[PDB]
């Protein structure tokens, strides 16, 4: 199956306190493997998964230098952006950045990303072809022009297509015991009438990895459903995930309805009966 | 592996 590697950076200015809170996190698929928090005592890039602890001190020194560089560039950005948006020193503002790689089942490059946001909105992004910039407004055009003069997109093209996929491949290999696994979901059926009869029903799924699941409700019909409630995938903490989908049906005991569960690794699209 | 190029100020 496909895989990805991505890094998330958030910097929040806190005027009247000092430097901005800066938090950086790295993921391989849905697994966090590194982090950096400007308020932590460590002041080092920290491992958050066993297979990354295999890298030597040279690697950690480098990641730490780079992540601090990122931090300080974002601190300069905060000052520059206030100017661009003609805003005051008193207000707290946020800068965000994300970039990464996607590869297919063949572990070959599929697509890259590099985007930036200001105060929760798109500011500038690198287009799908990794050659053009999507600038949100006038301020971002300024940035766009300087990033073009300095060939930022050529540099990111080199990182995203080469370095990021080469390292994604290395990480998948080093942690094949964890990253290259697949945990099947433990499904269930819960329907309570409690006070008023009218029975309901949702497809449970526990302890599954990765987080991608496409469960849906229907009875002997085609892929079309209409409801007003369902829950998004959520973390369990042990590294796994859990989700469900609700739909309303006629009163009485449990009727005859099929649940289509789609998850990777899983032998075949599971559909729990439980008619008692 | 963090990017070590293509990261500039806005």
């Amino acid at each position, epitope marked *: 199956g496909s895989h990805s590697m991505r890094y998330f950076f958030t910097s929040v200015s806190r005027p009247g306190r000092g430097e901005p809170r800066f938090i950086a996190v790295g993921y391989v698929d849905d697994t966090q493997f590194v982090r950096f928090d400007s308020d932590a005592a460590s002041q080092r890039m920290e491992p958050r998964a066993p297979w990354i602890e295999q890298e030597g001190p040279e690697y950690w020194d480098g990641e730490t*230098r780079k992540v*601090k*560089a990122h931090s*300080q560039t974002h601190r300069v950005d905060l000052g520059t952006l206030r100017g661009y948006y003609n805003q005051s020193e008193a207000g707290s503002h946020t800068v965000q950045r994300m970039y990464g790689c996607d590869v297919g089942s063949d572990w070959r490059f599929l697509r890259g990303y590099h985007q930036y946001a200001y105060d929760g909105k798109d500011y500038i992004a690198l287009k799908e072809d990794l050659r053009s910039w999507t600038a949100a407004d006038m301020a971002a055009q300024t940035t766009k022009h300087k990033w073009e003069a300095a060939h930022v997109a050529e540099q990111l093209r080199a990182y995203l297509e080469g370095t990021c996929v080469e390292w994604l491949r290395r990480y998948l290999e080093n942690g094949k015991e964890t990253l290259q696994r697949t945990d099947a979901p433990k499904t269930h059926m819960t329907h309570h009438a409690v006070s008023d009869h009218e029975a309901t029903l949702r497809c449970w799924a526990l302890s599954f990895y990765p987080a991608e699941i496409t469960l849906t409700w229907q009875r002997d019909g085609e892929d079309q459903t209409q409801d007003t409630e369902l829950v998004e995938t959520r973390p369990a903490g042990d590294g796994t995930f859990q989700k469900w989908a609700a739909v309303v049906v006629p009163s009485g005991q449990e009727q005859r309805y099929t649940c289509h569960v789609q998850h990777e690794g899983l032998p075949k699209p599971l559909t729990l009966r439980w008619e008692p | 592996e963090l990017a070590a190029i293509g990261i500039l100020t806005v």
Partner: T-cell receptor
Amino acid sequence: MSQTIHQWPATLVQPVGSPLSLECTVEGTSNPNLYWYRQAAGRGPQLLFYWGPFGQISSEVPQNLSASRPQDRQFILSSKKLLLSDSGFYLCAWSETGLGMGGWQFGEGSRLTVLE
Amino acid sequence: KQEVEQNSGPLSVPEGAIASLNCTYSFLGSQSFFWYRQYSGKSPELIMFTYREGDKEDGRFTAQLNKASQHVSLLIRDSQPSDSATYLCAVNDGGRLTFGDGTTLTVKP
């Protein structure tokens, strides 16, 4: 109008135990990365300090040496008491804010000879 | 050091010939590479940088990068005596440059 980097003094001959003060200035860019290297004969420059625009990023901790950055474009290397070992060719360098291809130029260096 | 290795030389090359300077690095995460020229008693002067596979030509200088073998080269075309100097190879291993000890070149007129 363009980008420049200067260093001084150019050469120093000084006794063991003496204080040291080298300066580095840059013009034509703002919020740059600043670096202090030391070069021994027959070898490549070795990193002493790497400061980003708001402070020190490098973890090396030399002996008798400290760096400071009183202004955005002013970088200082000091010692309160030099050791014979501190002889060397001290080089300052800069790079643009962030992690990019801009800059990476050295100043003209400061040759220091410490004598017993 | 050992992180970045270059032959020391002195490497002699006739005037008019191509000088081939080589460099090996051991830091897998290196994403950019640089070549400096250093005249005796002087500070290093930047020649080129590269961050992608293959060749990159700038006048008579051609840097070649091969990441699989972790090798970086510099070819000087139509060498001259004024090219006599020590050529430094540097690798960016984060937010800084790490240097080799250089390869001293001598071009006989």
